[PDB]
Amino acid sequence: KLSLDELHNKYGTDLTRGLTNARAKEILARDGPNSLTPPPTTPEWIKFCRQLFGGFSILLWIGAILCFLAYGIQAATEDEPANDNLYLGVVLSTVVIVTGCFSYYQEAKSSRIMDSFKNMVPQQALVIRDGEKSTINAEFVVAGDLVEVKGGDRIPADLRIISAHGCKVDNSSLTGESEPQTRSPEFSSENPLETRNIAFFSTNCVEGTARGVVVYTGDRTVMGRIATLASGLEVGRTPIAIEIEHFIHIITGVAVFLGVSFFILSLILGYSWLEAVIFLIGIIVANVPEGLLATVTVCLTLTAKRMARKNCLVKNLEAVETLGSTSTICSDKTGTLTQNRMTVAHMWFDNQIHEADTTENQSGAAFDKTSATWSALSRIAALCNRAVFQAGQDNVPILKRSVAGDASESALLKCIELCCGSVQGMRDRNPKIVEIPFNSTNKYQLSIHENEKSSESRYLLVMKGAPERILDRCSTILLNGAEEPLKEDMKEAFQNAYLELGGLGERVLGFCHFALPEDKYNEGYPFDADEPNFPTTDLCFVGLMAMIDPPRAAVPDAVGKCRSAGIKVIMVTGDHPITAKAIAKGVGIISEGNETIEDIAARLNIPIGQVNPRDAKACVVHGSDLKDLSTEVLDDILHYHTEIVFARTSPQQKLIIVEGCQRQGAIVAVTGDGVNDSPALKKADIGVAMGISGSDVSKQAADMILLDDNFASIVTGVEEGRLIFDNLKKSIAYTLTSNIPEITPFLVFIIGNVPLPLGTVTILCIDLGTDMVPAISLAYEQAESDIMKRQPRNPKTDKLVNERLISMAYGQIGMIQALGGFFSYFVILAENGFLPMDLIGKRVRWDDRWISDVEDSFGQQWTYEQRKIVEFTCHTSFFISIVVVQWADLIICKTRRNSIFQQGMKNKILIFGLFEETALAAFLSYCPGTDVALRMYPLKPSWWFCAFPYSLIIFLYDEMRRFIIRRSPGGWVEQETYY
Numbered sequence: 001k002l003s004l005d006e007l008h009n010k011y012g013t014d015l016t017r018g019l020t021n022a023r024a025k026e027i028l029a030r031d032g033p034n035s036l037t038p039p040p041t042t043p044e045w046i047k048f049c050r051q052l053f054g055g056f057s058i059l060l061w062i063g064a065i066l067c068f069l070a071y072g073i074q075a076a077t078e079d080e081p082a083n084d085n086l087y088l089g090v091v092l093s094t095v096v097i098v099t100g101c102f103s104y105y106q107e108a109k110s111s112r113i114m115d116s117f118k119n120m121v122p123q124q125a126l127v128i129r130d131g132e133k134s135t136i137n138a139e140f141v142v143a144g145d146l147v148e149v150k151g152g153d154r155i156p157a158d159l160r161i162i163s164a165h166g167c168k169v170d171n172s173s174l175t176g177e178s179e180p181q182t183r184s185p186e187f188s189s190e191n192p193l194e195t196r197n198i199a200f201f202s203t204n205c206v207e208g209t210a211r212g213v214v215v216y217t218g219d220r221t222v223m224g225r226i227a228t229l230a231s232g233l234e235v236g237r238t239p240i241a242i243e244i245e246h247f248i249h250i251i252t253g254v255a256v257f258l259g260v261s262f263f264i265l266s267l268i269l270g271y272s273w274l275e276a277v278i279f280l281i282g283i284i285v286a287n288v289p290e291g292l293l294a295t296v297t298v299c300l301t302l303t304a305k306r307m308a309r310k311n312c313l314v315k316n317l318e319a320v321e322t323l324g325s326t327s328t329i330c331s332d333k334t335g336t337l338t339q340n341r342m343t344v345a346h347m348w349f350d351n352q353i354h355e356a357d358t359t360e361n362q363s364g365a366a367f368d369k370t371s372a373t374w375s376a377l378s379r380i381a382a383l384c385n386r387a388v389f390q391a392g393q394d395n396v397p398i399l400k401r402s403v404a405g406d407a408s409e410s411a412l413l414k415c416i417e418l419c420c421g422s423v424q425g426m427r428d429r430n431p432k433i434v435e436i437p438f439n440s441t442n443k444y445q446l447s448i449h450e451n452e453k454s455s456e457s458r459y460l461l462v463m464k465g466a467p468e469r470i471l472d473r474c475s476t477i478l479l480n481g482a483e484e485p486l487k488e489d490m491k492e493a494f495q496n497a498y499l500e501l502g503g504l505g506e507r508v509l510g511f512c513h514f515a516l517p518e519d520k521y522n523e524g525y526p527f528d529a530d531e532p533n534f535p536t537t538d539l540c541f542v543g544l545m546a547m548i549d550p551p552r553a554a555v556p557d558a559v560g561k562c563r564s565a566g567i568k569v570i571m572v573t574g575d576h577p578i579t580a581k582a583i584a585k586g587v588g589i590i591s592e593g594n595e596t597i598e599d600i601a602a603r604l605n606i607p608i609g610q611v612n613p614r615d616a617k618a619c620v621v622h623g624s625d626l627k628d629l630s631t632e633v634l635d636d637i638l639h640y641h642t643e644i645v646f647a648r649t650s651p652q653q654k655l656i657i658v659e660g661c662q663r664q665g666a667i668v669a670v671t672g673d674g675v676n677d678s679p680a681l682k683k684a685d686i687g688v689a690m691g692i693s694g695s696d697v698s699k700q701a702a703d704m705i706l707l708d709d710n711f712a713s714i715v716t717g718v719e720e721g722r723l724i725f726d727n728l729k730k731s732i733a734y735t736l737t738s739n740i741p742e743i744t745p746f747l748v749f750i751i752g753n754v755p756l757p758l759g760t761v762t763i764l765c766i767d768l769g770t771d772m773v774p775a776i777s778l779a780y781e782q783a784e785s786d787i788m789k790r791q792p793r794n795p796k797t798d799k800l801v802n803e804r805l806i807s808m809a810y811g812q813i814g815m816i817q818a819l820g821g822f823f824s825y826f827v828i829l830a831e832n833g834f835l836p837m838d839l840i841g842k843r844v845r846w847d848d849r850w851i852s853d854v855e856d857s858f859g860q861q862w863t864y865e866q867r868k869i870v871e872f873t874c875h876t877s878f879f880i881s882i883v884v885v886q887w888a889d890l891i892i893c894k895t896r897r898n899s900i901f902q903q904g905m906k907n908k909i910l911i912f913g914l915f916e917e918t919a920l921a922a923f924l925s926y927c928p929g930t931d932v933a934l935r936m937y938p939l940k941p942s943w944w945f946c947a948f949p950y951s952l953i954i955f956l957y958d959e960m961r962r963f964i965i966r967r968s969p970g971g972w973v974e975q976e977t978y979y
């Protein structure tokens with residue numbers, strides 16, 4: 001409740017010149033940037049407690065505790081004790097600590113990449129300083145400067161409206177109601193939230209333009225004070241995640257059951273009540289997989305970094321998964337398909353077609369520049385146009401300089417300045433009184449100006465737009481200079497002219513004008529843009545103007561890839577069905593051979609109505625018919641046609657098409673740029689907002705932001721989206737196989753009563769060696785050729801972890817790695833004197849420190865450490881046999897449909913893993929001192945080869961398993977083993 005003078009006198013500001021740059025910076029440094037502050041959080045404290053002290057590591061923490069107590073009772077009691085317990089504790093503790101460090105290096109990394117994407121797409125407001133308009137980052141606006149807003153932009157700070165032009169804002173986020181409240185410079189209510197002279201933070205200007213003085217800036221804003229609570233906010237969990245968990249739950253159920261079962265087997269066999277609970281605890285801990293979620297989050301984050309390098313920024317992680325399943329892409333033409341760098345080609349007037357483009361000069365012998373009709377046409381183009389040359393281009397040529405405005409007005413302005421002269425004087429010769437702006441719903445631009453004729457003080461009215469709309473507003477035609485009527489002979493010549501200019505892939509516009517009678521509209525009467533002050537019809541059409549705009553380079557290949565993938569492409573354009581049909585013919589939407597109902601009517605020379613609608617694979621629907629049509633007809637066209645093109649479609653219409661595409665049971669992505677589009681961008685599954693030309697509304701309302709505004713970028717993004725899935729399945733498959741060889745020894749040991757084949761140290765060596773680096777390498781795998789030559793996926797029918805993965809890992813591959821390790825075990829014992837038949841039952845006697853007289857097969861007598869040494873040599877051999885079989889498992893994990901001879905060994909990280917693991921096994925087995933500390937003993941040369949036959953069998957089996965898949969689709973192998 002103040003005035004414009006009181007406001008400018010309180011903060012200090014020129015209503016018509018704004019602030020000065022020096023003063024603006026003085027205030028900018030005086031009170032801090034216009035950006036909210038970060039909220040409270042937990043430091044490394046709660047970050048490390050969850051890592052080193054979580055749920056699975058807790059048990060290891062116990063193992064360490066127990067062992068230390070085992071050493072204390074020893075050193076305190078027994079003279080000259082042993083040290084296997086002290087080193088066991090020193091090893092276990094180091095394992096919990098490392099696992100924690102690795103996990104930390106991953107959790108932080110993801111939390112940082114996400115923060116990087118937030119500054120990729122910052123926000124920039126329009127401020128007026130020293131009398132000039134400039135677009136600066138929202139973080140540089142201060143209190144006092146002048147700020148201008150336009151329908152589609154966001155209010156930067158708390159403004160005080162000083163001048164508005166039918167400006168409306170969406171005040172729904174703050175108080176909650178989306179009806180657009182109009183912002184007027186006058187004051188209306190005592191409550192600041194109800195008055196119209198104040199713009200607010202985070203609001204959006206729906207329609208209109210306005211000016212205002214920044215009253216409040218930074219955290220000193222309404223939503224800033226309210227943010228105390230907003231801080232907490234809310235997040236979510238992607239599908240894939242709730243898929244992995246679910247799995248974990250089932251496995252836990254299976255594990256708890258088996259625990260109780262192994263319990264009854266133990267007591268029916270005579271163990272100690274305590275030994276049965278010890279077994280239950282160990283078995284349930286060994287059946288539940290560990291790591292799944294960490295690898296899913298890391299893989300997703302890394303893939304997102306890969307996608308941002310290829311131009312696709314995602315507002316969240318759920319978009320990374322939905323992009324792969326994409327079935328339909330509803331894209332626009334001017335901005336996505338074409339280049340928006342248009343240029344005029346053919347003009348129509350005096351019932352004649354005229355060419356242009358006088359090579360940046362006055363040559364080319366286009367047409368007599370003297371033509372009267374041409375003077376009128378050149379004048380309306382130069383007058384109704386709203387674009388202007390960018391300041392300081394007095395040096396560059398007429399075609400290569402920079403302009404500000406629509407691409408249509410830019411092409412028009414350049415043609416008129418090259419062969420018609422300076423527009424600023426042409427614009428001052430006639431003074432502009434009232435102008436009405438373009439719009440997609442109107443489809444025309446009009447304005448009235450004074451007439452520079454010193455003998456005629458009347459008013460001139462000019463308007464341009466889609467040739468059909470303008471034709472409906474004319475009853476005369478400027479012909480050869482005079483006026484004539486629009487009868488059917490020239491009406492048909494005009495129709496054939498539209499197809500002539502349209503077939504050339506050029507855009508076409510209509511231009512008309514009319515002399516307003518100064519007797520009914522005097523020189524003093526003001527024609528406010530509210531009611532019908534100008535005769536819409538009865539105008540004088542002067543002539544058409546056409547311009548070219550070509551497609552992108554990579555576009556043809558993109559549509560071809562979509563056709564091979566089993567993806568439908570639809571062109572939704574606001575242009576004509578011809579120009580549409582043409583662009584479609586070029587990009588590849590409408591391939592050769594397919595015809596429409598009109599094509600068949602033309603070939604057969606039969607009425608279009610007689611032709612059978614099912615006979616045509618492709619079609620083109622118009623806007624008027626779409627307005628009239630119902631739901632069943634729409635489903636008919638969407639289901640029966642393969643290539644559908646939509647012309648003269650308004651923005652509000654789009655939602656119906658999207659709802660029809662989803663009714664079928666398909667995932668859709670829509671590209672948007674304006675304000676009317678926003679509703680659609682929310683209903684679809686993937687909202688692609690333009691980054692270059694988009695508005696704050698389109699970006700806030702969408703899931704993804706295209707950084708370059710290219711259609712070819714999308715298809716590449718979907719390729720990146722499918723690769724994530726393929727690699728995730730491969731990695732999980734490689735991790736789950738090692739479970740079988742680690743559990744089978746503890747089973748035969750208890751049931752069969754034989755010496756323990758695998759221990760604690762060796763098992764820890766397996767988990768950390770063959771499952772960490774090779775698994776990580778799998779993520780980096782390349783894409784198999786087939787990636788784009790395969791149908792999309794149905795999330796309901798195809799899941800990540802299904803009953804087939806467990807079939808390949810546990811059942812087929814696993815059992816083989818187990819047999820491979822058992823062979824090395826049997827061989828080591830047989831050679832040292834203990835044969836296989838004599839081994840069944842020796843455990844009871846084997847594990848007794850007191851029987852130094854143990855007798856072997858050849859009759860020798862063994863002490864306690866002499867036999868324990870051979871057992872440890874078996875632990876080391878088992879370990880190596882596991883690394884050897886892992887070689888094969890890893891190689892076969894690279895591809896699931898192609899062979900490795902086809903895919904190739906170009907992955908470097910995977911190779912690194914093979915060499916490094918082999919090195920770890922050789923090092924631990926041969927190093928001089930591991931004996932005392934880790935309990936591993938040297939392996940003789942003839943033993944390393946025991947696992948080789950089992951390693952080759954796995955590779956050959958998978959190779960054939962794949963050949964049968966490639967040859968017989970939908971067969972038994974694909975139904976059963978294709979995971």
Ligand SMILES: C=C(/C=C\C[C@@H](O)[C@@H](O)[C@H](O)C/C=C/C=C\[C@@H](O)C[C@@H]1O[C@H](C[C@@H](O)[C@H](O)C[C@H]2O[C@H]([C@H](O)[C@H](O)CC[C@H](O)/C=C/[C@H](C)[C@@H](O)C[C@]3(O)O[C@H](C[C@@H](O)CCCCCCC[C@@]45C[C@@H](C)C[C@@](C)(O4)[C@@H](C[C@@H](C)CCCCC[C@@H](O)[C@H](O)[C@H](O)[C@@H](O)[C@H](O)[C@H]4O[C@H](C[C@H](O)[C@H](O)/C(C)=C/[C@H](O)C[C@@H](C)[C@H](O)C(=O)N/C=C/C(=O)NCCCO)[C@H](O)[C@@H](O)[C@@H]4O)O5)[C@H](O)[C@@H](O)[C@H]3O)C[C@@H](O)[C@@H]2O)[C@@H](O)[C@H](O)[C@H]1O)CC[C@H](O)[C@@H](O)[C@H](O)[C@H](C)C[C@H]1O[C@H](/C=C\[C@@H](O)[C@H](O)C[C@@H]2C[C@@H]3C[C@H](O2)[C@@H](CC[C@H]2O[C@H](CN)C[C@H]2O)O3)[C@@H](O)[C@H](O)[C@H]1O
Nearest residue numbers: 066069070073267268270271272273282285286742746760
């Ligand atoms: C950290 C862990 C925890 C521990 C770790 C541990 O290892 C180590 O840290 C150590 O602790 C280190 C700690 C050290 C601490 C301190 C030390 O430093 C210091 C030194 O320690 C030394 C000790 C140390 O030297 C020791 O030796 C260490 C070992 O300890 C364990 C030993 O064995 C054993 O404990 C020895 C100790 C002693 O023996 C204890 C005895 C009992 C307590 C108790 O009985 C004695 C006594 O009686 O207790 C009394 C107290 C009472 O209140 C208690 C009440 C009793 C309740 C009764 C109810 C029973 C119950 C319960 C019901 C639920 C069900 C039910 C059926 O039974 C039901 C039925 C009722 C109706 C029964 C009623 C019975 C009545 C009984 C009671 O009344 C009492 O007995 C009674 O009151 C008594 O007073 C009385 O005397 C009674 O006597 C008799 C009773 C009978 O005896 C008794 O009842 C009997 C027999 C029952 C029998 O079952 C009957 C049967 C026959 C049956 O019925 C039968 O006939 N069947 C006939 C069948 C038949 O015909 N069939 C014919 C078929 C025809 O068709 C009599 O009968 C009764 O009448 C009479 O009343 O109710 C009281 O105090 C006294 O009385 C006392 O004497 C073993 C270990 O713990 C340890 O090694 C000390 O000597 C020394 O002085 C000290 O200085 C977690 C573990 C790990 O998770 C796991 O890995 C684990 O490590 C492995 C499993 C190890 C195994 O493998 C190792 C090698 C490698 C492994 O590590 C590998 O890692 C394995 C892994 C595992 C998994 C899988 C796989 O492999 C790998 C895969 C993983 C991979 O995948 C991953 C992915 N996630 C990644 C990767 O990791 O992980 C091996 O080395 C291990 O050896 C091996 O085990």
Ligand SMILES: CCCCCCCC/C=C\CCCCCCCC(=O)OC[C@H](COP(=O)(O)OCC[N+](C)(C)C)OC(=O)CCCCCCC/C=C\CCCCCCCC
Nearest residue numbers: 743744745747748752754815818819822836837838839840
């Ligand atoms: C829980 C999941 C486990 C997964 C794999 C577990 C691996 C376990 C494999 C073996 C463990 C059992 C212990 C074997 C000891 C049995 C000894 C035996 O058997 O002594 C019989 C013969 C020895 O004859 P001799 O020359 O000394 O007699 C000479 C006679 N004179 C001279 C008078 C003419 O030994 C033979 O013939 C060959 C016997 C060697 C071992 C055969 C064991 C059974 C056969 C295949 C097992 C693999 C099954 C795979 C199943 C996959 C799904 C689970």
Ligand SMILES: CCCCCCCC/C=C\CCCCCCCC(=O)OC[C@H](COP(=O)(O)OCC[N+](C)(C)C)OC(=O)CCCCCCC/C=C\CCCCCCCC
Nearest residue numbers: 785898899900901902903948952955956957959960963966
């Ligand atoms: C010290 C440690 C040494 C370790 C040595 C390991 C040796 C390897 C072990 C076994 C190898 C044999 C496995 C054969 C399995 C069948 C593979 C198969 O059927 O692949 C089919 C592919 C055809 O694919 P496509 O036409 O669909 O591609 C289309 C590509 N697009 C789409 C671009 C046109 O064929 C191809 O890629 C052509 C590839 C041909 C490779 C032939 C290898 C066989 C030669 C000797 C094998 C060893 C025999 C016994 C050895 C005992 C050794 C002591």
Ligand SMILES: CCCCCCCC/C=C\CCCCCCCC(=O)OC[C@H](COP(=O)(O)OCC[N+](C)(C)C)OC(=O)CCCCCCC/C=C\CCCCCCCC
Nearest residue numbers: 887888891900901903904905906914915918948951952955
């Ligand atoms: C005693 C008996 C033991 C039996 C045990 C069995 C063990 C496992 C059995 C087999 C595993 C090894 C199989 C190796 C496969 C080689 C395949 C190959 O050669 O496919 C030729 C490729 C294709 O080329 P392209 O241009 O047509 O691809 C175009 C790709 N597109 C179309 C995407 C552009 O060429 C390339 O990949 C580029 C050249 C890559 C050369 C890789 C050489 C390294 C191979 C293995 C490393 C050793 C690891 C073991 C470490 C322990 C050692 C102590």
Ligand SMILES: CCCCCCCC/C=C\CCCCCCCC(=O)OC[C@H](COP(=O)(O)OCC[N+](C)(C)C)OC(=O)CCCCCCC/C=C\CCCCCCCC
Nearest residue numbers: 090091094765768769920924927928929930931932933934
């Ligand atoms: C990637 C992760 C996967 C695997 C992770 C495994 C985690 C394990 C972490 C730590 C384990 C520490 C093991 C400590 C090594 C032994 C220390 C020790 O307690 O030794 C005690 C022995 C004394 O025995 P004694 O007197 O009873 O013998 C009597 C012999 N009689 C009587 C027959 C003559 O000391 C001796 O023998 C003297 C020999 C000293 C041995 C020097 C070897 C250096 C050890 C590690 C350095 C290697 C790091 C790798 C760097 C790679 C660079 C590229």
Ligand SMILES: CCCCCCCC/C=C\CCCCCCCC(=O)OC[C@H](COP(=O)(O)OCC[N+](C)(C)C)OC(=O)CCCCCCC/C=C\CCCCCCCC
Nearest residue numbers: 905911914915916918919922938939940941942943944945
């Ligand atoms: C481009 C870069 C490629 C890199 C590939 C991997 C690099 C491989 C690195 C090293 C491998 C060579 C190892 C040579 C070691 C010989 C040392 C030796 O003196 O050893 C003697 C033993 C005999 O022991 P004994 O029990 O009779 O006497 C015991 C007598 N006492 C115990 C009383 C003393 O003999 C043995 O260990 C035999 C040793 C094994 C013989 C090698 C057979 C493999 C040959 C080629 C396969 C290479 C894979 C490439 C595949 C490419 C596919 C595209």
Ligand SMILES: CCCCCCCC/C=C\CCCCCCCC(=O)OC[C@H](COP(=O)(O)OCC[N+](C)(C)C)OC(=O)CCCCCCC/C=C\CCCCCCCC
Nearest residue numbers: 949950952953954956957960961964968969970971972973
């Ligand atoms: C140390 C040893 C190292 C090497 C060991 C090598 C072991 C690997 C050897 C073979 C791999 C076994 C793979 C098992 C898959 C067989 C499954 C099968 O039965 O699938 C039959 C399919 C039928 O498909 P469908 O759609 O008509 O079914 C329609 C079904 N309904 C009517 C119900 C809808 O395909 C057909 O019938 C036609 C295709 C038949 C393919 C036969 C492939 C034989 C290839 C190699 C075996 C020879 C190895 C020789 C080595 C000598 C070693 C001493």
Ligand SMILES: Nc1ncnc2c1ncn2[C@@H]1O[C@H](COP(=O)(O)OP(=O)(O)OP(=O)(O)O)[C@@H](O)[C@H]1O
Nearest residue numbers: 332333334406408438440444445465466573574575
């Ligand atoms: N400044 C303008 N004034 C008047 N008419 C214009 C102007 N710019 C373009 N036109 C024409 O008005 C009509 C409205 O087109 P509109 O902007 O709705 O869609 P479009 O150019 O086909 O683009 P897109 O498919 O990207 O939405 C078109 O025939 C266009 O050529």
Ligand SMILES: CC(C)CCC[C@@H](C)[C@H]1CC[C@H]2[C@@H]3CC=C4C[C@@H](O)CC[C@]4(C)[C@H]3CC[C@]12C
Nearest residue numbers: 058059060062063066070274275277278281282
């Ligand atoms: C699920 C996990 C964490 C439970 C771990 C249980 C541990 C603490 C239990 C399991 C078996 C127990 C041992 C069983 C037998 C004996 C022998 C006795 O003379 C001293 C105690 C001692 C050595 C016990 C100590 C505690 C012990 C090691």
Ligand SMILES: CC(C)CCC[C@@H](C)[C@H]1CC[C@H]2[C@@H]3CC=C4C[C@@H](O)CC[C@]4(C)[C@H]3CC[C@]12C
Nearest residue numbers: 740743744747803804806807808809810811812
């Ligand atoms: C350690 C040993 C004794 C365990 C042996 C486990 C074997 C028998 C288990 C491991 C994985 C299992 C398979 C897992 C999935 C399926 C798919 C289902 O539609 C039919 C059963 C089938 C094919 C299972 C059969 C039993 C199976 C092969």
Ligand SMILES: CC(C)CCC[C@@H](C)[C@H]1CC[C@H]2[C@@H]3CC=C4C[C@@H](O)CC[C@]4(C)[C@H]3CC[C@]12C
Nearest residue numbers: 823827831941942943944945946947948949952
């Ligand atoms: C392709 C297929 C059929 C070849 C199978 C070859 C079999 C018979 C070969 C492969 C590796 C070989 C083993 C390699 C090393 C040793 C250690 C030695 O001290 C005793 C023999 C023994 C245990 C061999 C026995 C024969 C063996 C198992």
Ligand SMILES: [Mg+2]
Nearest residue numbers: 332334335673
């Ligand atoms: Mg558009």
Ligand code: NA
Nearest residue numbers: 290291767771
């Ligand atoms: Na693990």
Ligand code: NA
Nearest residue numbers: 682683684685
């Ligand atoms: Na959405």
Ligand code: NA
Nearest residue numbers: 734737738889
């Ligand atoms: Na594996």
Ligand code: NA
Nearest residue numbers: 735738739771
């Ligand atoms: Na594992």
